[PDB]
Amino acid sequence: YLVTEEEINLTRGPSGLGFNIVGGTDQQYVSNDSGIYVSRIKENGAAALDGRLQEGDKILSVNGQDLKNLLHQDAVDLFRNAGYAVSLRVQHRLQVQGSAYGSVKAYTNFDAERDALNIETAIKTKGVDEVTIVNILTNRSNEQRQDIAFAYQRRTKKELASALKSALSGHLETVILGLLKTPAQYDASELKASMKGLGTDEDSLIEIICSRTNQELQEINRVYKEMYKTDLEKDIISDTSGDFRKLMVALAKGRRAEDGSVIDYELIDQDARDLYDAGVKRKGTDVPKWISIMTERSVPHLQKVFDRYKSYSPYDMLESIRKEVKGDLENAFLNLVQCIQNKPLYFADRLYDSMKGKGTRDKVLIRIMVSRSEVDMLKIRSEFKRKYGKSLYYYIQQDTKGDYQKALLYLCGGDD
């Protein structure tokens, strides 16, 4: 929501300025907004010709007279009792979402209390209307979802999530609840879910901990502390072992070098030499020196390191991992290198794996659709279609059914 004010000089068109206005104290467009907003700009009218004005601006002044807290009619009158030469102060109100490459965008005509009310309708309905719940939650941003929950708490004294927990079930429930959770909560939850088995969901732990950034991980680490009264680092230690533990615990610190300004070419060469020397060039492997280079260095640096590695090593980094280590450690390294090299491709391959064969690994599918829909889902779809020849939408369509399917399809954003 970036706000910039501006003046615009219009010469009245044939029959008027060429736009429609809405709002007023007695006609609030969104709750608690008496502002006067342009709704339509006429097709081939004077307003379109000057351009500047945009379907959505807030009118604050007409010929110097302010539009704050007016009834609809008084604002209309100011326009109709004006000259043919009209100058107005507008506030352009562009809003930008976190990533440009997420699929779920913040809804432009957002009203927290209104949304909350229709959801209550869909809950307070015989059979419950699972469709309208999906239609608003998957089209609202995560932060918009927060505000929905807050207004829901207010209107019911019950919170949004535990009303959907009673009114939803199956795979559909998982998705909706996951979207209700902030990115830190959801990740913290999937993480607590991973370790609460003693045998532990290594593949999921590897997925989150290899793919989250410093910013995300530090947020997880704090919220993890708040939800389960343990340090996440402590749980990792208690449910892993060997160099896998060292690799995981080092990543989960979220203390990787942030992308500096200058490119350290000397260090790129040194790191490449050391990865070669520590591994394929030597009998056995120096795992700790792998762990240090791959956890400590920034992502752009490591991408470049992996290319320089090919200058020295007859195999590339992934191929070198497969021939030096096995088990969870091999797994963690292959996943970490994929995330460093192409994270959207990483996720597109995990999604394909979760659907390619019999049944569906629903936990991996849901998790990715929820946690990447506002990050890089569009890059994920582009890599998916390029590699697999059919869209992500299509695979979701072939593997999932019902309202659950339509929910995943919305988080996908569309076909390709």
Partner: peptide, 5 residues
């Protein structure tokens, strides 16, 4: 609600 201007 909407008003041409």
């Amino acid at each position: 609600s909407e008003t041409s201007v």
